[PDB]
Structure 1
Amino acid sequence: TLPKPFIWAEPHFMVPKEKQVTICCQGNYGAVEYQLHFEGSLFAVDRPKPPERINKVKFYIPDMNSRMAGQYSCIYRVGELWSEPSNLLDLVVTEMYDTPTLSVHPGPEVISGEKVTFYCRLDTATSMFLLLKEGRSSHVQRGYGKVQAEFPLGPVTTAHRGTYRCFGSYNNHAWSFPSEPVKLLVTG
């Protein structure tokens, strides 16, 4: 019938407080109404006009705050029928309260083969920490620990090069400021 919609965040799902993010929803060409839902509520509506050559709509967020951090989904309509919900997208708010420290073992310059571990520390937060690697091989890892979490990389390759920052969290959707960055240099 109607293909499952797909949503994603731009530039990504990690949104500094007071900053802006957009959520795209892909439905289907000719779809006449798109709704963005946030945790059981209607967040926003788009009505493509003309709809024939449109299969994606953009939902804007001007002013990120803690109350907009949570789970979103999108549905769309062609005729009278609504699609199934999209994948469920989590937005988080960052730049929240305190700043964590990030350290690296054995050090920020290594040769391929050396085992590298990052440690994130933050004093008055939950047990959940996040390690963010920036750039092209850019991704977020979640770890747990009391006041400090470890993030073992194992034996590194050149693939591990990059700039790391870490976050603490006050809840699963509300994160600290990012740590000062650590740039991991890997030879060989």
Structure 2
Amino acid sequence: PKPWLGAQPATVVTPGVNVTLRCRAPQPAWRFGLFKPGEIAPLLFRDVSSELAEFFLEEVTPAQGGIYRCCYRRPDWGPGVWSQPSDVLELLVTEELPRPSLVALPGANVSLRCAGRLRNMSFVLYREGVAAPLQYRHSAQPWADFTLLGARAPGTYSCYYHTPSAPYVLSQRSEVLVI
């Protein structure tokens, strides 16, 4: 039975902060291991006698990012037997979130989509010549759709997105989309 692996405070963070990775097995275990892609031995492990093991990652750098899985092990199990792995948990430690893309949608009212590669983000649309955000939208899906009404449609637009709470991790600005 696979354990579960979760991150606090978040799964996307700025370098410097502290992260706790928590692996919960569905039954009591002896050893918990955190595994990265391409390495067969666990990167880190804890011998606890619990369903739960916690790995404190201090002042994180991009070395602490990447794909994580957790596996656990009971001592009465055969040599080299671990449990099924948890679903992956990928930790993104970065000062700049990947650039989103602003594209025109099919369709009077024009529709734009600002698409990034992360879920649960806040998206902000700008029109060149205007200093304050033209529009803004929080989305669960990794995109936001903004609508432009008639004679307002023409212009040069760009968007970006950021984490929905402080401290903020900001993406770079999309390339411009001319309408």
Cα separation, 1, equivalents of 2:84 and 2:90: 18
Which residue of 56, 59, 63 corresponds with 1:63? Answer: 59
State, as a whole percentage, how many aligned pairs show the same letter. Answer: 24
Letter in 1 for 2:145: P
- Deviation at residue 138 of structure 1 after TM alignment: 7.5
RMSD value, Cα: 3.8
Cα gap change, 1:87 to 1:119, in 2 (>3 Å): closer
TM-score by length of 1: 0.54
User: In 1, are the aligned partners of 2:161 and 2:170 still within 8 Å (CA)?
Assistant: yes
User: Quick check: 1:17 aligned with 2:11?
Assistant: no
In structure 2, the residue matched to 1:32 is 30
In structure 1, the residue matched to 2:72 is 76
| Secondary structure in 2 matching 1:4 | coil
Cα separation, 2, equivalents of 1:83 and 1:129: 31
- Deviation at residue 100 of structure 1 after TM alignment: 7.5
- Deviation at residue 88 of structure 1 after TM alignment: 0.8
User: In 2, are the aligned partners of 1:33 and 1:76 still within 8 Å (CA)?
Assistant: yes
Cα gap change, 1:138 to 1:21, in 2 (>3 Å): farther
Cα gap change, 1:133 to 1:177, in 2 (>3 Å): closer
Cα gap change, 1:138 to 1:75, in 2 (>3 Å): farther
User: In 2, are the aligned partners of 1:133 and 1:140 still within 8 Å (CA)?
Assistant: no
Structure number with greater Rg is 2
TM-score by length of 2: 0.56
| Secondary structure in 2 matching 1:83 | coil
Cα gap change, 1:11 to 1:115, in 2 (>3 Å): farther
Letter in 1 for 2:38: G
In structure 2, the residue matched to 1:158 is none
In structure 1, the residue matched to 2:175 is none
Cα separation, 2, equivalents of 1:129 and 1:119: 10
Cα separation, 2, equivalents of 1:82 and 1:15: 30
User: In 2, are the aligned partners of 1:129 and 1:166 still within 8 Å (CA)?
Assistant: no
Letter in 1 for 2:52: K
Which consecutive unaligned segments of at least 5 residues does structure 2 have?
Answer: 101-108, 124-137, 148-159, 163-167, 172-179
User: In 1, are the aligned partners of 2:13 and 2:169 still within 8 Å (CA)?
Assistant: no
Cα separation, 2, equivalents of 1:74 and 1:61: 15
Letter in 2 for 1:152: D
Cα separation, 2, equivalents of 1:11 and 1:138: 19
User: Quick check: 1:166 aligned with 2:161?
Assistant: yes
Which consecutive unaligned segments of at least 5 residues does structure 1 have?
Answer: 102-113, 121-127, 143-150, 155-164, 168-175, 180-188
- Deviation at residue 63 of structure 1 after TM alignment: 2.0
In structure 2, the residue matched to 1:105 is none
Alignment size in residue pairs:
128
User: Quick check: 1:141 aligned with 2:137?
Assistant: no
In structure 2, the residue matched to 1:89 is 89
In structure 2, the residue matched to 1:152 is 145
Cα separation, 2, equivalents of 1:88 and 1:99: 20
In structure 2, the residue matched to 1:125 is none
